[PDB]
């Protein structure tokens, strides 16, 4: 469960909820195609955060992160 915000150069913004990291990346890729200026990710997992950040840093998009989840990786 991840929350997503996006705002356009048109001064218009939208809110989305993603059930998993595979839904969240689909909201982001659907936003960056439009020329979205700002993106927010909240409750995001560390791989989704790196995946979103790798896109946002290459586009120069003003992303913000309010996710990151600690522990619970374990060993095997």
Give the closest residue to 28 by CA, choosing from 60, 63, 69: 63
Task: Check residue 50 and report its DSSP letter.
Answer: H
Technique of determination: NMR
**Cα–Cα distance, 11 to 28 (Å, whole number):** 18
Bridge-based pairing of strands 2-7 and 13-18 is antiparallel
**Cα–Cα distance, 63 to 70 (Å, whole number):** 21
Sheet of 38-42: strand order equals 13-18, 2-7, 38-42, 62-66
Backbone angles phi, psi at 48, to 5 degrees: -60, -40
Residue 4 lies in a domain: no
Residue 22 lies in a domain: yes
How many structural domains does the chain have? 1
Query: Domain residues for 31?
Result: 18-66
Residue 33 lies in a domain: yes
Residue 74 lies in a domain: no
26-59: b or e for each residue (b if 16 or more CB lie within 10 Å)?
Answer: ebbeebbeeebbbbbbebbbeebbebbeebbeee
Task: Check residue 73 and report its DSSP letter.
Answer: -
Q: Both ends of the chain: CA-CA distance in Å?
A: 26
For residue 3, count other CB atoms closer than 10 A to its CB: 16
Residue 62 lies in a domain: yes
Residue 54 lies in a domain: yes
Residue 12 lies in a domain: no
**Cα–Cα distance, 65 to 11 (Å, whole number):** 21
Residue 34 lies in a domain: yes
């Amino acid at each position: 469960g991840t929350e997503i915000e996006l705002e356009s150069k048109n001064g218009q913004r939208e809110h989305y909820t993603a059930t998993s990291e595979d839904e969240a990346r689909k909201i982001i890729e659907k936003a960056v195609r439009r020329g979205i200026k700002r993106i927010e990710l909240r409750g995001a997992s560390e791989q989704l955060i790196r995946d979103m950040q790798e896109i946002a840093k290459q586009i120069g998009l003003q992303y913000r992160t309010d996710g990151s989840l600690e522990h619970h990786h374990h060993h095997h």
